[PDB]
Amino acid sequence: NGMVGELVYGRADVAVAPLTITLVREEVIDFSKPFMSLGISIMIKKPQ
Amino acid sequence: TYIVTTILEDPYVMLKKNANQFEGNDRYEGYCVELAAEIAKHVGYSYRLEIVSDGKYGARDPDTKAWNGMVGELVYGRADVAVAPLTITLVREEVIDFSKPFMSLGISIMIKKPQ
Amino acid sequence: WFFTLIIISSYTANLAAFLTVERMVSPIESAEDLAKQTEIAYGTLEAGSTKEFFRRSKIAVFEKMWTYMKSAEPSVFVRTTEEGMIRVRKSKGKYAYLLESTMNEYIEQRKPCDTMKVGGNLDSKGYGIATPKGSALRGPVNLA
Amino acid sequence: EFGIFNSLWFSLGAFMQQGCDISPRSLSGRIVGGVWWFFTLIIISSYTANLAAFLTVERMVSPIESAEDLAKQTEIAYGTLEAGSTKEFFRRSKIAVFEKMWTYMKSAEPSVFVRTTEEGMIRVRKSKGKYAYLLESTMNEYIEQRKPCDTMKVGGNLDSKGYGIATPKGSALRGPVNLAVLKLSEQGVLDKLKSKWWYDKGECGKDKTSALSLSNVAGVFY
Amino acid sequence: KSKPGVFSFLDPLAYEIWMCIVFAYIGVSVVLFLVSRFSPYEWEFGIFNSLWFSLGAFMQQGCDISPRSLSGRIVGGVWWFFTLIIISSYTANLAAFLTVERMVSPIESAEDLAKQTEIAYGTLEAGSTKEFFRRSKIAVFEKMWTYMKSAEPSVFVRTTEEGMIRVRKSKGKYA
Amino acid sequence: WFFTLIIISSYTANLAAFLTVERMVSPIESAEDLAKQTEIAYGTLEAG
Ligand SMILES: O=c1[nH]c2cc(C(F)(F)F)c(N3CCOCC3)cc2n(CP(=O)(O)O)c1=O
Ligand SMILES: O=c1[nH]c2cc(C(F)(F)F)c(N3CCOCC3)cc2n(CP(=O)(O)O)c1=O
Numbered sequence: 246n247g248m249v250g251e252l253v254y255g256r257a258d259v260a261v262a263p264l265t266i267t268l269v270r271e272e273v274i275d276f277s278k279p280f281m282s283l284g285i286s287i288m289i290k291k292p293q
Numbered sequence: 294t295y296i297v298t299t300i301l302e303d304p305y306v307m308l309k310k311n312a313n314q315f316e317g318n319d320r321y322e323g324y325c326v327e328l329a330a331e332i333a334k335h336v337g338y339s340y341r342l343e344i345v346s347d348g349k350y351g352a353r354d355p356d357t358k359a360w361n362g363m364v365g366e367l368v369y370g371r372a373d374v375a376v377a378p379l380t381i382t383l384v385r386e387e388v389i390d391f392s393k394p395f396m397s398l399g400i401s402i403m404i405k406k407p408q
Numbered sequence: 409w410f411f412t413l414i415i416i417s418s419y420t421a422n423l424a425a426f427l428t429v430e431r432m433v434s435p436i437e438s439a440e441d442l443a444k445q446t447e448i449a450y451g452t453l454e455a456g457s458t459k460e461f462f463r464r465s466k467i468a469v470f471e472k473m474w475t476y477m478k479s480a481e482p483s484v485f486v487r488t489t490e491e492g493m494i495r496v497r498k499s500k501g502k503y504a505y506l507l508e509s510t511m512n513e514y515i516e517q518r519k520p521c522d523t524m525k526v527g528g529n530l531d532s533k534g535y536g537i538a539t540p541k542g543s544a545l546r547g548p549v550n551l552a
Numbered sequence: 553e554f555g556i557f558n559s560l561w562f563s564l565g566a567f568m569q570q571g572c573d574i575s576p577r578s579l580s581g582r583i584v585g586g587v588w589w590f591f592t593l594i595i596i597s598s599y600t601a602n603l604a605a606f607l608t609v610e611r612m613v614s615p616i617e618s619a620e621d622l623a624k625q626t627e628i629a630y631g632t633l634e635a636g637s638t639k640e641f642f643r644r645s646k647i648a649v650f651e652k653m654w655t656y657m658k659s660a661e662p663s664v665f666v667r668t669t670e671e672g673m674i675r676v677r678k679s680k681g682k683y684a685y686l687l688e689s690t691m692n693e694y695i696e697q698r699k700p701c702d703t704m705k706v707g708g709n710l711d712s713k714g715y716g717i718a719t720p721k722g723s724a725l726r727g728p729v730n731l732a733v734l735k736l737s738e739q740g741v742l743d744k745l746k747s748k749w750w751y752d753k754g755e756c757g758k759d760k761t762s763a764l765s766l767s768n769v770a771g772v773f774y
Numbered sequence: 775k776s777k778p779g780v781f782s783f784l785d786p787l788a789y790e791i792w793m794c795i796v797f798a799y800i801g802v803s804v805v806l807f808l809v810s811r812f813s814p815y816e817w818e819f820g821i822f823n824s825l826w827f828s829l830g831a832f833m834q835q836g837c838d839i840s841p842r843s844l845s846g847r848i849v850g851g852v853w854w855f856f857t858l859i860i861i862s863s864y865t866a867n868l869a870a871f872l873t874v875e876r877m878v879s880p881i882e883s884a885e886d887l888a889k890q891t892e893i894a895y896g897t898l899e900a901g902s903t904k905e906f907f908r909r910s911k912i913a914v915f916e917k918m919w920t921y922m923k924s925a926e927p928s929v930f931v932r933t934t935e936e937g938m939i940r941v942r943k944s945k946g947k948y949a
Numbered sequence: 950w951f952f953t954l955i956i957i958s959s960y961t962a963n964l965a966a967f968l969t970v971e972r973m974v975s976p977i978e979s980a981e982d983l984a985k986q987t988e989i990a991y992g993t994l995e996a997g
């Protein structure tokens with residue numbers, strides 16, 4: 246489904262979204278080198 | 294059997310203290326050596342951990358327009374894969390293929406511990 | 409005189425106690441910190457990659473966090489990112505949300521400004537530009 | 553006899569919890585005296601209490617916590633390696649903060665630059681916290697966990713870059729190697745390896761409060 | 775075992791502070807005497823009374839007599855200030871001493887030994903204990919093994935007697 | 950005067966210490982303690 250679907254089934258020829266590079270998606274499409282590095286992080290209520 | 298080029302940089306690839314006592318791939322220890330082990334296990338192939346003679350990460354000298362170091366050793370067919378802390382860059386990307394980064398990093402500030 | 413001596417010493421001693429513990433208070437500056445303590449609760453989206461990261465994790469800290477999150481009633485997990493954000497806002501510092509760093513930083517700059525990101529990342533991911541397999545755009549886009 | 557000089561002496565003695573030769577006798581003098589007595593009691597107790605707090609728990613604070621701090625301040629020096637790409641990042645930056653930092657670093661006497669990372673590390677060590685060295689984050693974290701364990705990394709990263717596995721341009725290993733790296737990343741192998749070789753092998757993984765020395769009361773003697 | 779020490783009540787301040795307090799006491803008493811007397815306009819602050827005023831000021835017991843001149847009041851005022859700072863410093867540092875003596879948690883687990891670095895520890899070079907460490911799959915013992923590998927001077931002992939004596943001699947730096 | 954100053958400071962200092970850090974101590978630390986004491990009761994399963 247989604248943007249990966251739209252690329253696999255020829256409906257689109259590029260995706261420029263925050264699309265996470267992963268093994269499963271790497272198998273079916275080609276990714277570029279990451280344009281934005283990130284990770285999981287902790288958000289807390291700001292101490293006032 | 295593939296030749297896997299490498300550089301000497303702690304803690305990536307380090308000569309074990311019992312270097313003379315060991316021979317082969319078990320001459321070396323570190324982060325990158327176990328990475329190469331795992332990569333081989335997943336792909337299949339077998340390898341020997343060669344070390345870049347010059348001991349430098351590659352660069353293209355403008356005067357001669359030649360590649361040195363690991364990138365040179367990889368572009369001129371001497372090596373089959375480089376498992377080292379090579380930085381992904383545009384100039385190097387044009388000449389070789391890189392994998393997705395196995396380690397993200399950046400520039401940072403080092404100071405003396407406050408006392 | 410005796411009453412005075414006891415009462416004044418009590419005032420001084422208790423004020424020292426107040427100021428000393430106010431000076432021992434360490435915030436959450438890391439994930440293991442959130443893990444080992446129990447006073448603050450924390451959760452993630454019910455459906456998404458973060459939950460999967462936790463479910464499949466072989467690392468001690470994240471295994472512990474998963475065991476906690478699963479064995480938690482009322483459920484720490486939230487329906488949508490907005491729900492988690494509001495739960496953090498209205499929890500009064502007893503709920504921490506766990507989410508992608510980029511969304512965290514974005515939400516940090518949106519009023520109400522009563523959220524912050526603590527510590528480094530637990531994981532490393534990237535976002536990329538994607539092209540169909542065997543496209544001619546691939547190499548140019550990568551270099552770009 | 554509360555003339556102005558005696559008034560000043562009464563008040564001083566009240567604040568120092570010393571005596572008085574004379575006390576007020578009127579209602580108005582006693583109100584004044586009473587509130588000054590209450591004020592004194594609170595203020596002195598606050599001084600003692602807070603000094604106890606300070607001496608009980610040690611909070612050591614790093615002056616720097618970001619790159620903009622190195623930018624705005626001037627007392628602390630900072631420089632890179634000439635040989636490496638780090639210098640070049642600054643030389644061509646075109647971000648305000650880093651452009652300013654480059655302008656500083658170029659016009660710095662003596663030379664902020666060093667030849668090798670060892671030289672920079674020693675320079676940071678030797679100085680009492682007046683030189684900050686800019687370098688790759690991974691090397692920074694490694695050095696932080698190695699002996700003598702007297703440095704630290706401060707703030708976030710200034711830029712973002714990656715290390716990859718390289719293969720020759722036409723190679724058939726490419727796709728397999730790429731998928732291998734992604735698989736390792738997602739299985740947590742790479743994190744584990746980094747943890748092992750940075751932290752688990754780390755050399756350097758709130759008591760015995762001392763007598764006050766002459767040095768931290770020398771001012772009162774002077 | 776903790777045997778306090780007969781004059782341990784002096785511990786909050788260094789020996790040099792106590793000795794300088796005594797010198798300051800004498801100097802203040804002598805200057806108070808001098809500025810109170812040689813003024814021939816008046817000549818109750820002889821030397822003995824000066825010493826008594828100063829002593830009582832330091833102990834915050836007040837006085838039968840206070841200085842009336844400007845010079846005597848300057849002397850008195852600075853000695854009052856000094857007294858206030860020094861006494862508060864004594865009480866504050868004593869609180870600090872007794873508070874941390876009360877925060878100290880003993881070692882009573884393995885991970886406790888593992889995480890810290892102040893205490894060193896070893897085992898026989900040949901034994902099942904060493905094997906248990908070498909093959910250990912959990913964090914704590916793996917970390918302890920890694921530490922024991924990088925031991926200088928060598929933690930491992932030839933005989934149990936050697937280890938026992940090392941513990942005895944170490945003064946709580948070897949387990 | 951000197952005695953008074955030390956004693957009163959010791960009282961204030963030690964109360965600060967007490968109020969700063971809580972230490973709860975268990976009365977029992979062994980079976981012989983249950984034996985010697987009589988204030989605390991103790992019993993097992995009626996049959997086991
Ligand atoms: O490729 C992906 N890119 C994503 C990018 C973003 C954002 F940063 F906001 F752009 C987020 N947001 C944070 C979480 O709440 C929803 C919105 C989700 C993403 N998800 C969903 P996952 O399945 O949870 O990873 C992807 O899959
Ligand atoms: O590909 C590259 N990989 C690199 C990897 C590392 C390290 F992290 F240690 F593994 C280092 N360290 C920088 C810190 O001091 C020690 C050497 C430099 C590298 N350089 C040189 P630069 O990028 O020109 O500075 C490269 O080129």
Ligand SMILES: CCCCCCCC/C=C/CCCCCCCC(=O)OC[C@H](O)CO
Binds near residue numbers: 582586587
């Ligand atoms: C015979 C002559 C005697 C006359 C002179 C005596 C003066 C001594 C006492 C002063 C403190 C008085 C004021 C105490 C402050 C009250 C503040 C208060 O009640 O605060 C409420 C609180 O803030 C709700 O939240």
Ligand SMILES: CCCCCCCC/C=C\CCCCCCCC(=O)OC[C@H](O)CO
Binds near residue numbers: 558561852
């Ligand atoms: C009628 C009354 C007669 C008056 C009697 C006079 C004596 C005053 C007494 C004590 C205060 C002296 C202590 C305060 C000394 C000031 C110096 C100081 O605090 O210096 C800090 C420095 O500026 C670092 O920034």
Ligand SMILES: CCCCCCCCCCCCCCCC(=O)O
Binds near residue numbers: 788796
């Ligand atoms: C104004 C006079 C006040 C009285 C002060 C008491 C002086 C104590 C004794 C001073 C000598 C040194 C004592 C410290 C010795 C030590 O513990 O090492």
